[PDB]
Design a protein around this nucleic acid. Structure first.
Ligand SMILES: [K+]
Ligand SMILES: [Mg+2]
Ligand SMILES: [Mg+2]
Ligand SMILES: [Mg+2]
Ligand SMILES: [Mg+2]
Lengths: 134, 137, 91, 86, 208
RNA sequence: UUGUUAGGACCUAAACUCAAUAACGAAAGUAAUUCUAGUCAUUUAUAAUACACGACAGCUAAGACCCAAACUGGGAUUAGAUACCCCACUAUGCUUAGCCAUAAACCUAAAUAAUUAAAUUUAACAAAACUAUUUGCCAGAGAACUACUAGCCAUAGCUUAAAACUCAAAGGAC
């Protein structure tokens, strides 16, 4: 038994899913590893069909740090979906997929360059009938 | 000969003093971290108000009033008023489980106050009041 | 041939000999680079020596067995054997 | 309300590491289940749903523990091939 | 390409090959020994060991060339450098000893320092979000920053000049005027930076 | 109004962790603590026209009212939602006396005593299969949890329950 057993609306779902997943990742509720990653969430984008849910997490500088964060986050995404249905945030939640967002690195970059910038001064076949004949 | 996470026991004699103050005397920083607004109040150990702040009082409005950076600003503001009144060490009782639960404690550190302990007083009823009905979304 | 019913009598007859050599060297007990600038014969060349079709998994297993032979102490007979399956690399 | 204040749920800061104290306090409040309790207590969960969930959580744990046991029972047999070539 | 991917770009640095073996870093030393068993691409017709060959000036020539007329484009660049050298000699001779010291008469150094003065640190890429075209501040690479300086020069001279003036006379007057940080190309650079400061707040709307 | 109170009052309502437990009761149902009363022997299965019970929701009268809350009102939403969302508040959820007798009241498994071999997946999916005993129930589908009759503190209800009619399907698991 056990082995066999085992527009406006999208705005509301996208914002609330972001509002809730940020809370799940601020505590060890999902896992102690997920808590230590100190992951930040750029935004959540739910598809029109609701087949999947995109979670954009602010990527970092180190590829190794990002590769580890991706693996840990993905493994817990299935469990994270359980926590939102169990706390009654949303009755139905799509499979949560974790996507990278490297804009945060770009956002810091612009300010550094901009400050240094020089602005300048201001039927018949099937039947046996054929066969039986000969 | 090791540090103890457990706080000193009231009514006993301990060797731990901060700025020539015992644990029972250090002022208390009450952080109410809700899902919309993070309020902060600092009081003396005799329950006298010294500083007060919140995301709203800083000037944040509506949804921005309930972010991490908004509480951080509120904590720095509470520190400044308390630092003027003569406060260097605070006991942080953080009620609530909202977004600025940690950020408000981080703002108080940035503002020049020294946290010696972190307590939690989030209300947990033992059986209480029926919560509101689940939101259908 | 006693291995006729395996379907690859020549591939398995060769893997039988190389596995028996390995056992005697391991039971009985220097630099292994006796030959340099050489490569292991490609599957197409091996298939020609055996005269039977081999799969990619069969080729990989044969090479791993031949490598194990080189790791172990090798008398002059073993060096001549592994030489048969070493083809001079194009210079 | 009637108990003594500052004994319950109180961690002490070591050498001004205010973040380490907070991170430990969260691990405490989560290991004791207060975090899940506070989250779920935000909205009313009806008794029929509570039993269905707690039943699913129990069966899910049993399945993971047995699968973990099997993966660890064959952890030792995952070693270099002793009979390479045959 | 007719070159298989195994081919290596040629290295046409005369001193590098004649350096003493000990003066070469082991990384460089490794590449030389590796290259002995590899294939090398034939050198381009414009690639030589000449001591007067400047890659930046050679690139600027190709960006002025039209329809494969390299002789004409090289002639225009050669005439330009001469037009700048002759313009600085006149000023140098007609200046006091004190002024003469500052005056620079090397055209190659006026060209490089001019282009560098026209390079923009940040850029703006035009994007569409919410039914309107919203550009956003971007950080520019070393290649995009260099290309923009050359392209802006070759475009100011080609268009915004009198009908009877010639490119060696408009380009010389712009390299020198840019070399002093007062030309119109420098203004174009100021506008690009100035626009980015206005849109600094709205950098969020970037997906690439 | 808010935050704090190692201040006062109130004792309304509900019983965290334990509970990763599987106990009790005929079923419904029952888990804050203490005390009092209390479950028990009919060989066993087999009962209505009798007796006693029966979640939630609902009615009657007098109370209670922390919080929740059909509904109602105000605010948003949209090409427009009596929707979903926000705020306020009511019937109601509580108590003490009466009534209502309905749930996918389902472990969708009647209750008992067997056996694990009959060289038995005896459709398939569920929950291995099968035998004996006693009662209840079923006999293609829609018409029909309907009409009528009868009983009933119920009066749109509840239980009981057809025919004409029309078709060659309806239905179940994969
Ligand atoms: K309304
Ligand atoms: Mg009571
Ligand atoms: Mg008793
Ligand atoms: Mg009421
Ligand atoms: Mg009748």
């Amino acid at each position: 038994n056990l082995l066999k057993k085992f527009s406006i609306r999208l705005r509301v779902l996208n914002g609330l899913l972001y509002k809730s997943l940020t809370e799940l990742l601020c505590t060890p509720q999902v896992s102690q590893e997920v808590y230590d990653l100190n992951v930040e969430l750029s935004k959540v984008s739910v598809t029109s069909d609701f087949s999947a849910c995109r979670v954009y997490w602010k990527t970092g500088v180190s590829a190794e740090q990002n590769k580890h964060t991706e693996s840990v986050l993905q493994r817990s995404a299935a469990y994270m979906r359980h926590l939102l249905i169990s706390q009654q945030t949303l009755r139905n939640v799509p499979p949560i997929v974790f996507v990278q967002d490297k804009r945060d690195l770009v956002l810091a970059e612009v300010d550094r360059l901009l400050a240094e910038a020089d602005f300048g001064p201001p039927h018949r076949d099937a039947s046996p009938r054929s066969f039986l004949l000969g | 000969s090791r540090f103890s996470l457990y706080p000193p026991v009231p009514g006993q004699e301990s060797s731990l003093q901060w700025a020539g103050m015992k644990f029972e005397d250090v002022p208390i920083a009450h952080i109410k971290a809700t899902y919309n607004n993070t309020q902060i109040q600092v009081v003396s150990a005799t329950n006298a108000s010294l500083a007060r702040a919140s995301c709203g009082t800083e000037g944040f409005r509506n949804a921005k009033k309930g972010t991490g950076i908004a509480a951080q600003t509120a904590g720095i503001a509470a520190a400044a008023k308390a630092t003027g009144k003569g406060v260097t060490h605070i006991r942080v009782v953080v009620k609530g489980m909202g977004p600025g639960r940690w950020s408000a404690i981080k703002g108080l550190t940035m503002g020049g106050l020294e946290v010696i302990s972190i307590t939690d007083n989030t209300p947990v009823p033992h059986x209480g009041c029926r919560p509101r009905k689940a939101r259908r979304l | 041939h006693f291995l006729f019913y395996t379907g690859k009598q020549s591939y398995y007859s060769l893997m039988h000999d190389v596995y028996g050599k390995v056992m005697q060297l391991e039971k009985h007990r220097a630099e292994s680079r006796d030959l340099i600038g050489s490569r292991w014969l490609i599957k197409e060349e091996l298939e020609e020596m055996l005269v039977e079709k081999l799969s990619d998994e069969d080729y990989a297993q044969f090479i791993r067995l031949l490598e194990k032979l080189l790791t172990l102490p090798c008398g002059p007979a073993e060096e001549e054997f592994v030489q048969r399956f070493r083809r001079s690399v194009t210079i | 309300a009637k108990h003594l204040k500052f004994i319950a749920r109180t961690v002490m800061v070591q050498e001004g590491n205010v973040e380490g104290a907070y991170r430990t306090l969260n691990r405490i409040l989560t290991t004791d289940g207060l975090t899940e309790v506070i989250s779920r207590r935000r909205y009313y969960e009806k008794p029929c749903r509570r039993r269905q969930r707690e039943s699913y959580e129990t069966c899910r744990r049993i399945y993971n523990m047995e699968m973990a046991r099997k993966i660890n029972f064959l952890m030792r047999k995952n070693r270099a091939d002793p009979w390479l070539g045959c | 390409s007719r070159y298989a991917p195994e081919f290596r770009e040629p290295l046409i640095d005369k001193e590098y090959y004649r350096k003493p073996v000990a003066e070469l870093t082991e990384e460089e030393k490794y590449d030389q020994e590796l290259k002995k068993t590899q294939f090398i691409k034939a050198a381009a017709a414009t690639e030589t060991s000449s001591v007067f060959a400047d890659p930046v000036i050679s690139k600027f020539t190709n960006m002025m060339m039209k329809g494969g007329n390299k002789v004409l484009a090289r002639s225009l660049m050669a005439q330009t450098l001469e037009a700048v050298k002759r313009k600085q000699f006149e000023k140098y001779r007609a200046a006091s000893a004190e002024e003469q010291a500052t005056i620079e008469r090397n055209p190659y150094r006026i060209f490089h320092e001019a282009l560098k003065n026209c390079e923009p640190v940040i850029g703006l890429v035009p994007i569409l979000k919410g039914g309107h075209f919203y550009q956003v501040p971007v950080p520019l690479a070393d290649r995009r920053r260099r290309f923009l300086a050359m392209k802006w020069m070759i475009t100011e001279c080609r268009e915004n000049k009198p009908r009877r003036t010639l490119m060696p006379e408009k380009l010389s007057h712009e390299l020198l005027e840019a070399f002093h940080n007062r030309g119109p190309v420098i203004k174009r650079k100021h506008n690009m930076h100035k626009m980015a400061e206005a849109n600094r707040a709205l950098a969020h709307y970037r997906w690439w």
